[PDB]
Amino acid sequence: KVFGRCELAAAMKRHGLDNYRGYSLGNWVCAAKFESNFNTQATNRNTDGSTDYGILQINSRWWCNDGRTPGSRNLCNIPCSALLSSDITASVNCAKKIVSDGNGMNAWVAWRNRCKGTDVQAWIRGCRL
Numbered sequence: 001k002v003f004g005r006c007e008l009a010a011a012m013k014r015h016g017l018d019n020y021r022g023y024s025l026g027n028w029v030c031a032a033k034f035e036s037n038f039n040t041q042a043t044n045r046n047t048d049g050s051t052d053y054g055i056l057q058i059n060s061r062w063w064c065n066d067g068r069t070p071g072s073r074n075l076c077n078i079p080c081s082a083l084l085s086s087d088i089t090a091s092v093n094c095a096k097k098i099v100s101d102g103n104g105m106n107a108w109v110a111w112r113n114r115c116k117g118t119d120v121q122a123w124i125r126g127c128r129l
Ligand code: NA
Pocket: 060, 061, 062, 063, 064, 065, 066, 067, 069, 072, 073, 074
């Protein structure tokens, strides 16, 4: 599924991401834009052999099991394929654990490089939330 901007904002809010660990909804939508372009099926291989999965490009190195990331953990206790679903429940649940890990949204390098400090509210601008 390719979400619309305001459609993803509504989904994330419903699943309790807005202001989770003090991160406004615009932060989550901005991170999704530059991680996945709002595409739930997005997969990208890392140089280390791990893979990033879904709207928030959750990494098989720590968070999900894809069976091909040697020496890796599955701290969200899910198959990485669960993170490609049209339903973002699993991605949100797991993203809650990632952002709680101590470095906040800095865990998403594209959040740090492209969203952090910017006018993130623009991302929910004109959305009926
Ligand atoms: Na893993």
